[PDB]
Amino acid sequence: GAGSVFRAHVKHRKGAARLRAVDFAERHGYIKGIVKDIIHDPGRGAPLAKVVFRDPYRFKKRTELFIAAEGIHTGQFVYCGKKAQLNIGNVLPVGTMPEGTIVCCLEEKPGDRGKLARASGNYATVISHNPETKKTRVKLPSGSKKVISSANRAVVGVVAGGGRIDKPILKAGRAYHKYKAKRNCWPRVRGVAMNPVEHPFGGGNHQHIGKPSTIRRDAPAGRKVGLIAARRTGRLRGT
Amino acid sequence: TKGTSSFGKRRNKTHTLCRRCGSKAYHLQKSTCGKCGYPAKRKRKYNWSAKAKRRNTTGTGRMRHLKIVYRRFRHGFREGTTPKPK
RNA sequence: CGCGACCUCAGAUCAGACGUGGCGACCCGCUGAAUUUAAGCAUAUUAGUCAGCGGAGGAAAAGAAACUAACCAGGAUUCCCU
RNA sequence: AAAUACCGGCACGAGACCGAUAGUCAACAAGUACCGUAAGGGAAAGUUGAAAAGAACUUUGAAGAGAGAGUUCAAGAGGGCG
RNA sequence: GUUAGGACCCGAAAGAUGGUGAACUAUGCCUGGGCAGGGCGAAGCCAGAGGAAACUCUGGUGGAGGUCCGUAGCGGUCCUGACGUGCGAAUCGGUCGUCCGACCUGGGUAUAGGGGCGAAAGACUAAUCGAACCAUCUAGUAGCUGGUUCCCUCCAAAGUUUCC
RNA sequence: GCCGCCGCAGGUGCAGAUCUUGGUGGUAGUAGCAAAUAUUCAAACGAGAACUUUGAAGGCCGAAGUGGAGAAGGGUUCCAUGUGAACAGCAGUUGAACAUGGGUCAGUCGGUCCUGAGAGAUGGGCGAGCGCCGUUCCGAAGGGACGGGCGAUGGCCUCCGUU
RNA sequence: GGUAACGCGACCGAUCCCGGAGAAGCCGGCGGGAGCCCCGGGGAGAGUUCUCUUUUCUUUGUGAAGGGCAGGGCGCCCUGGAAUGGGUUCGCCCCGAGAGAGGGGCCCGUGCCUUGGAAAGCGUCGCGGUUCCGGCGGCGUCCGGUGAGCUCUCGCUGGCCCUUGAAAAUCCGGGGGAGAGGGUGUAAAUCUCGCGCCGGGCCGUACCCAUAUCCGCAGCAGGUCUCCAAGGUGAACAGCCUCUGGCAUGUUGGAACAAUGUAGGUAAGGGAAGUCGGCAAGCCGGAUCCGUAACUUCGGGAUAAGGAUUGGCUCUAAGGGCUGGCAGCCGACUUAGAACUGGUGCGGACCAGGGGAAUCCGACUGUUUAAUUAAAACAAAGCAUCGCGAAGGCCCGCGGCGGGUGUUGACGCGAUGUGAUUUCUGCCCAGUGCUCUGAAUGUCAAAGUGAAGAAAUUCAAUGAAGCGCGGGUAAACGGCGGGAGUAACUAUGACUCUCUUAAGGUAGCCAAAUGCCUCGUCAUCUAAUUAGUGACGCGCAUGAAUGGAUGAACGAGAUUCCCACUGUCCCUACCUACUAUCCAGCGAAACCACAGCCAAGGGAACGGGCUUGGCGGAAUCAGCGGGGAAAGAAGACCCUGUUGAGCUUGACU
RNA sequence: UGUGGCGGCCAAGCGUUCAUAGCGACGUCGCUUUUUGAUCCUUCGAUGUCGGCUCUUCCUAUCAUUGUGAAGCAGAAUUCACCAAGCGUUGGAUUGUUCACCCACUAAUAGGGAACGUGAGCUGGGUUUAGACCGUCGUGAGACAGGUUAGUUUUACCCUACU
RNA sequence: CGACUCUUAGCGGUGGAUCACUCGGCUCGUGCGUCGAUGAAGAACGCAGCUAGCUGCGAGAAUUAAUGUGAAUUGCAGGUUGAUCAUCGACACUUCGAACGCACUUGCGGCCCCGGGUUCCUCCCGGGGCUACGCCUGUCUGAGCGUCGCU
Ligand SMILES: [Mg+2]
Known part of the structure; x- marks a missing residue:
């Protein structure tokens, strides 16, 4: 697939939630706004809220x-x-907040108006600060510690809608409407059941793999299917 | 079921008559003329289509300006003169 | 702030001149595949090949030397013969 | 500019070419009628009598369809009629 | 008598170039419509009884599901029935699976050929899909089949040596 | 309109090729005019009535109809008069058959106004090339207007469309 | 004007800002109002009237536009403060953040009648014009309460979503006071109130909407987008009979009733014993009442398995509104009981369950090769890991900071392997692939440096990525042996030893959709069982996320047994319709070297034709399939050609 | 006629005794195609090929029955052999089965051909188009005399022959 | 006898075979060898007394004004001082269409000038001229703490 079929269908979802434009009022001042109303936006799992300011x-x-x-x-x-x-x-x-502060909607660079850690129930944790040359180590929810130039801004608190994936899926009738709302790639077909003229793992009379699933990173399109540069596999032992 | 029961559903025509060339070659969905070309300024012509050259020739139409061009060329291009009266 | 110009760049129902495209037997400049030949086939051959794009003319191309040449020398271009 | 190319068009002439299933597919209201949703494909088809002098008049029969007459060198040429 | 050009004639299994098709089928988006008659009582709740408490039973309300018998509607397991030079280049009878939800679908639009679509069958793509239709190269190739037209007279054959 | 003779030239000699086109036979008056219940009498224009007309009787479809109206689509198929060349697998006086004519009337009915899925001109850039990317994307992007001043016009420039 | 919801008749006012309609999912339940139906009496037309019948049917009012009155919703403001807890729904919810008791008030009113409006229209009877005439005259165009009857609209309330249910043009609503108006009246401006005058361009308007006007070569059983929908029987928009409307049997008519065809039924007696195959075909069938096992994910089983009843006539009892402990008046359907009685008859025609116990696979609803397979196939609920922090993960592209993911941020984007509940997923890096690390490094292009030569040429160190090197990787591919002695009668094996790689098949299942030998050995069902179930693995070649054990309910899945009944059969027989046959009218197709009396011989080793022997004596009609190597298609099997295509690899470029 | 089957010759000898009732060691002479092999003559412009159901005639290498010989035939009974195909030679459980096994019975439950008799006469259970499962091998598209499961059967009206 | 199967002589039907006729095709050469926004090529639609197709033409519509020459056409209606035809140098030359105001539903804009309406006071109706793209030398108009002149 390349496009026009597997794309996410976005019709009722209008706009995107962006962070406020930077100025002197965010540089060396502060300003007050009001909360109008919160509403569950379609497509996004986490709900949004109207915050009214004035110019x-x-x-x-x-x-x-x-x-x-x-x-x-x-x-x-x-x-x-x-x-x-x-x-x-x-x-x-x-640079104003102390270390050990649970923040979300964090910027990787000052200016992109909020990219990192703003999904349903995610937050990046500030490990420690650095006063000289404005550096800050922030641990991401994956585990890596990124260095941020401390010029950005971020809200305080976790995102509402936590623990959505703890319960298993009840039935395929709910699953069909959910994935029909999200993206049309739900009938996942096995590559052995697929035809060998298009999918590389197909073919043969019996249902067998017969080839190593590990693949080199340097690989062209069409071949690159499977565990991409797998260091280990199986059950995760320990950490 | 691929035959007579399938001919019954076919009612919505896509191709229709064009206004430039005047042939059954106007697709309503793509909005492009298949014969000559409605959005483009040029007319679609090819050398392998030998019969399409002899379908629409210049000798088929009027040549109402071309025949008086030849009729003025055989005289020698006089410009608005009058014949001698009585 | 106020006054006059040089350069860069601006919009037309400003006066007046152009190109758009149908067709094109001949021609100019470019891209230019394989059926086939090689009793198979890849080098070679078919082959600057069909087809495609742009363009004017009754012709276009074309034209007076940083030439042939080792002869006792000739001296813009073009077509035919050996 | 000069001798070079022309299968389309504008005016003709000529032919040891063909003669109505032949010759351009098309000698006639031919790319016309017609088919396909479309790029497209693509037919059949001449010979009255020199001259229409194309049959008036009688009868059968609802009319169609017959039987006698007339024209002309001949109907032995009777409206799809060398 | 022989070779090259269409080279006694016709004939494929395929390749390239350029245009055209999602009106049948297949996946979406937008705007809309439709889907009888009945069973089961899942949750909220009331009163009574027992018990020291914790709490436990009894009698009513009430309507829940990837619910059922089953209409409209969607496809046709079996009888290999009728027809089988058909009404029909894929119809009909007995007969079913399903029928408030993974239900069918009316119009506009997106996706086109070594590409697209595909709950995955080289399955489908206009009566054609192990690579769609038409034109050109193309009179492509054929150690291979099929045929190849007047008379009279004279002469008069081989199924092998060697090679690839 | 044609033949022989002397030389020359050919698209010059047919029985086939599941050869091409056209024409005609045995078959053969064979097979056939069977998916869905049903018709029967009197008179009649007309030469002519198992099929058409009216009058009577008996039934079917059983409101999810063998009913009335729409959309796509068809394009005079609607009606009147006359006709008997061909069709309605026999049949026809009849019929969507042939020829002459009529027949569709909107300030109030729908399109016309707008956007949705989507397409697309254009700044800009790419591309030898017909052309391609994109729908703000690197742009000199509002040609519109409330009021104030100054010269001028139409109606005693008074007040308005005025410029 | 009023404390107020709000109303009356016009009752100013820019730029700019804000809000609303526009403009919003589905389902369940309840209530109100209309339309269509139901009934009694009264009127105008007809049928029945040998007999009775106050009988049978057609019919009985009002639009748009303005106003009033009903009737609903009130999350609308006041007098007052409620637990000994109140009002209240079919269900519930609310309440000192303000219940019940009381007064007003706006929103919709399609129900009533008034202007429209009886003038029109519907009938009955008569008068003309023989006719042309919105002709003429008399009468009616009613009196009432109801109903879980069917349909439409509105209102109230709850549930469902890991899915939140569209945008654009348009209008007025609200703050807002810079400006326009004036000196006491005939004031100026301001007019969304009642009016008066003139116009609203263009395009299309006929017919069908289907077994004769759409598509299928056609009067084509096929496909075919939507609205309107009477009475009884009955839970039913199910099935049958009648009302309105339509129709004259769908490319033909008459005659008799052969065989063999097609569709139906009836069949004495046994009842799957025929056949791979209860395949087809047949039985049971609904309602009420009693009652119900094994196993279990306690939900299902289940309608388990099982039994009794199914008429007519005529009675009794039980359940409600209005008015003034109490009496009268209006009353619409259901349930229970009893006797008489019908030829044991009753879901009298229509509708109309086959179960019980086992084995294997898949949970199942669902998608599916238009046109041979609907299933154990796929989608699949669960689980396991790989890469990636926008300087990138993946895909597309010929190109431009190209597009998608991305309107997106590890609870995210792609990729797989398996795939309802419950336990496990062992050992092994031998090999092939994946990942990490480096100058301790054999190898190492181009380019650069230095040296020799009159120059093209020659030599030397350096020598990038990658290979080799060290580690992990078996929810990556895969793999997980053989031979001898041996324990007190013997049979047989614990145990021990050796060869050998990476440890040499761990636990379970099993002559399986998996065992050649093999119809392997034992209990079982049967007279008999190459059949099925229950056993041991020793398994040509079983084996643990390429998966195994187990599995409640189910599968148009594949098999075994028993009840139930049947012309499957014993064993055939009979009836109807449509057929077939003859007559009037019309009227094909396939096939065709030529024709069709035989036996033996030979042949290109099976002839109708040649030879020898038998025979053959007009012409047609209803059957039949033995032959015409019956028609079909240069065989769909095999091979070859120095003939082509797809998949795949470490063949070659 | 390599294979199956049958009939004669000599008769080591068994048969208590005794070659020839019943037979037979060692060789040995002929036969056939309901079987397995070899061969390649015609058929690749095709003769629709496995079994099961109904169907008829023909042959004898005779199982019984009719009529006679021959014993180690007291009687029944056992067979050895002739004339001899006139008339007879079942049902069921399993297997798709050809083949093979069992039970009950009778008179015997003897053996075969007809282009492997037999589809314009039926049936598709298995082979014998693709779909999937498990096991083995091949790195790989695939192969398994190793299985499982569902898989479209057209027309006589022409001639001869039969009635 | 009749009827049916076969052969021969004469005749009738389907067929248009042979021959003949050709305002028709095929080849070669000669001189010339041009479209258009001043709207080309192409397609659709209308125009005749009775007029389907072809041909001709564009609302002036099977064709005008004029020249050489001189009494037509036909199935029928009608008239030498110019009817028939040939010539054409003058004009007309519809709508779409390179098509040029936007789309291509023929619906919507904008500017100027005239006639009813009026008595410019404006709405409504009719007619005419106009209204695309990039570019060039003359006019027009304003941008630039780049320059600097002067206060
Ligand atoms: Mg049996």
């Missing part, structure tokens, strides 16, 4: 989409800035 130069009722945190209510004043206090639901730079 300091203009007079249009602005609004901003943020990820809804766990344990928050509507009709609440949210402060944002460098000089803001420490509470749940507050975006602030990393």
Whole structure:
């Protein structure tokens, strides 16, 4: 597959939740907005919420989409800035907060308005800070510690909607509508049952593999199917 | 079931008559003329299509300007003169 | 702030001139595959091959030397014969 | 500019070429009628009488269809009629 | 008498070049429609009885499912029935699986050929799919089959030596 | 309109090729005019009525109809008069058969206005090339307008469309 | 105007900002209002009237546009503060953040009648025009309560989603006060109130919507997108008979009733004993009442298995609204009981379950090769790991910071292996692939450096990636032996030894969709069983996520046995219809060297034709299939050609 | 006629005794195609090929029955042999089965051919198109006299022969 | 006898075989060898007294004004001082279409000038001229703490 079939179907999902534009009011000041209402957005598992601000130069009722945190209510004043206090639901730079702070919607670089760790029940943990040359080590939920230049800003708290994948799938009738809403790649067919003229692992009379599933990283398209550069396999023993 | 029961569902025509060339070659979905070419300025022609050259020739149509071009060329291109009266 | 120009770049129902495309037997510049031959076949041959794109003319191409040449020398280009 | 190429078109002439299943597929209201959703494919088809003088008049029969007359050198040429 | 050119004639199993098709089938998106009559009582809840407590039973309410018999509707297991030069280049009878949910689908649009689609059968792609239709190269190749037209007279054969 | 004779030239000699086109036979008056219950009498225009007309009787489809109306699609197939060349597998006076004519009337009915899936001009860039990517993407992107001043016009420039 | 919801008749006001309709999923239940039906009486038309019958059927009102009155919803503001807890639904929920008791008030009103409106229309009877005439005159165009009857609309409330159920044009609603208006009246501006005047361009409007107008070469049993839907029987939009509407049997008519065909039934007696094959065919069938095992994921089994009943006529008892402990008036259906009685008759025609116990596979609903296989195939609920932090994971591309994933961030994007519940997933890096690491490094292109030569040429160190080197990788492929002695009668084996690689098949299952020998040995069902179930593995060649054990309910899955019944059979026989046959009209196709009386001989080793022997004596009709090596298709089997295609690899480039 | 089967010759000898009732060691002479082999004459412009169901005639290498010989035939009974094919030679469990086994009975339950008798006469159970399962081998597309399971059967009306 | 199977002489039907006729095809050469926004090629639609197709033409529509010459056409209606035809140098030359205001549902815009309406006071109707792309030398208009002149 290349496209136009396996893509995710996005019709009722309108827009994306972006972080507020940086200025002097986020550099060396703070400003207050209100929480209008929260709603479960289609497509995304985590719900969104309307946060109404105002422009300091203009007079249009602005609004901003943020990820809804766990344990928050509507009709609440949210402060944002460098000089803001420490509470749940507050975006602030990393150089002001101390170490060991559970944050989400983190930026890998200052300017992209929030990319890292903002899915359903995910948060990156700041390990330690560095005052000289503005460095910060942040452990990602995978386990790797990334170095961030401490110019970005991030909200406080975990994302609402945690523990969604703990319960197994009840029935294929629910699964068909869920994957029909998400993306049309649910009838997963085995490559042995597939034809050998298109899929490489097909062919033969009996149902057998007969070839090593490990594959080199340097491989062209069509061949690159399977465990991609598998160091080990089987049951994970220990860590 | 691939035959007579399949001919019954076929009711919505796709090809229709074009306005430039005037042939049954206008697809409604692609909005492109199959014979000559409706969006493009040029007319679709090929050398392997030997019978398509002799279908639509210049001798088939009017040649209402071409025949008076030859009729003025056989005189020698006089420009708005008058014959001698009585 | 105010006053006059040189350069870069701007929009037309500004006056007036152009190109668009049908067709094209001949021609100019480019891309230019295999059926086949090699009793098989890959080097070679078919083969600057069909086909495709752009362009004007009654012709186009074309033209006066950083030439043939070791002869006792000739001296723009073109077609035919050996 | 000069001698070089022309299978399409504008005006003709000529032929040890063919003669209505032949010759251009098409000698006639031929790429026309017709078929395919489409790029496309693609037919059958001449010979009245020199001259229509194309049959008036009687009868059978609802009319169709016959039997006698007339024309002309001959109907031995009777409306799809060398 | 022989060779090369179409070279006594016709004939495939295939290759390349260029256009055209998702009106049948297959996957989506948008906007809409439809789907009788009955069984089972899953949850919320009331009163009574027993018990020191914890709590346990009895009698009603009530409507839940990838629910069932089953209509409309979707396809046709078996009888290899009728027909089998058919009404029909794939129809009909007995006969079923399913029928509030992985249900069928009316219109517009996206996906086209060493490519697309595909709950995966080289399955389907306009009566054609182990690589769609039409035209050109193409009169492609054929140590191979099929045929190849007047008379009279004279002469008069071999199924082998060697090689690839 | 044609034949012989002297030289020359050929698209010059047929029995086949599951040869090509066209024509005609045995077959053969054979097989056949059987998916879904049902018709029977009186008169009639007409030469002519198992099939057409009216009058009577007996039934079927049983509201999920053998009913009335729509969309796609068909394009005069709707009606009147006359006709008897061909069709309705016999049949026909009849019929969607042939020829002459009529027949569709909107301020209030739908399209027309807009967007959805999607397509697409164009800044820009690429491409020898017909052309390609993209729908904001590197752009000199509002040709619109409330009010104030100044010269001028139409109606005593008064007030408005004015410029 | 009022404390107020809000109303009346116009009752200003820019830029800009905000909000609403637009504009929103499905299902269950309840209530109200209409339409179509049901009934009693009264009217206008007809049929029955040998007999009775206050009998049978057709029919009985009102649009758009303005207003009032019913009737609903009220999450709308006040007087007041409730637990000994109250109002209240079919169900529930609410309540000192304000229940019940009381007053007002807006929203929809399609139900009532008023203007429209009886003038029109529907009938009955008569008067003309012989006719042309929205002709003419009298009468009716009713009186009422109901109903889980069918349909439509509105309102209330709850449940379902790991799925949240669309955008655009349009309008007014709200703050907002820079401006336009004026000096006491005939004021100015302002008018969304009632009016008055003129127009609203263009395109199409006929017919069918189907066994004769759409497509299928056609009057083609096929496909075929939607609306409207009477009475009884009955739970039913199921089946049957009748109302409105339509119809004259679908490419033909008459005659008799042969065989053999097609569709149905009836069949004395046995009842799968015929046949691979209860295949086909047949029996049971609904409702009420009693009652129900093994195993179990306790939900299913289950309608388990099983039994009794199924008429007519005529009675009794039980359950409600209105008015003034209490009496009267209106009453719509269900259930229970009893006697008489019908030729044991009753779900009298239609509808209309086959079960019980075993084996194997797959959980199952679902997709499926248009047109031979619907299944053990696929989708599959669960589990296991691989890569990746936007300077990248994957795919596409000829190209432009190319596009998709991405409107996306490890609970994410792709890729696999297996795949309901419950236990395990062992050992082994021998080999092939995957990953990590480096100058301690055999090997090592191009280019650069240095040296010799008059120069093209020659030599030397350096020599990138990768190979080799060291480790892990068996939810990667895969693999997991053979020979001898031996324990107190013997048979047989514990145990011990040797060869050898990576340890040499761990535990389970099993002559299996898996054992050649083999119909392997034992109990079983039967007169008999190459059949099935239960056993031991010793297994040509079983084996533990290429999977194994187990598995409640189910599969248009594959087999075994018993009840149930049947012309499957014993063993054939009979009836109807459609057929076939003859007559009127019309009227093919296939095949064709030529024709079809035989036996023996030979042949290209099986002839109708040649030879020798038998024979053959007009012409047609209904059957039959023995032959015409009956028609079909240059065999769908095999081989060859120096003939072509697809898959696949470490063949070659 | 390599294989199966049958009939004669000499008669080591068994048969208590005794070659020839019943037979037979050693060789040995002929036969056939309901079988397995070899051969390659015609058929690759095709003769629809496995078994099971119904169907008829023909042959004798005779199982019984009719009529006679021959014993180690007291009687029944056993067979050895002739004339001799006129008339007879079942049912069921399993296997797809040809073949083979068992039970009950009778008179025998003897053996065969007809282009491997036999589809415009039936049946597809297994082979014998592709779909899947398990086991082995091949690194790999695939192969397994090793299995499992479901898998489209057209037409006589022409001539002869029969009635 | 009749009827049926075969052969021969004469005649009738289907067929158009042989021969003949050809305003028709095939080849070669000669001189010339040109379209168009001043709207080309192509397609659709209308135009005749009775007019289906071809041909001819474009609302001036089977064709005009004019020249040489001189009494037509036919199945029928009608008239030398120019009917028939040949010539054409002048004009007309519809809609789509390189098609040029946008789409291509023929629906929607914008500017200017005239006639009803009026008595410019504006709505409605009719007619005409206009309205695409990139580019060139003359005019137009404003951008640039790049330059610097002057206050
Ligand atoms: Mg038996």
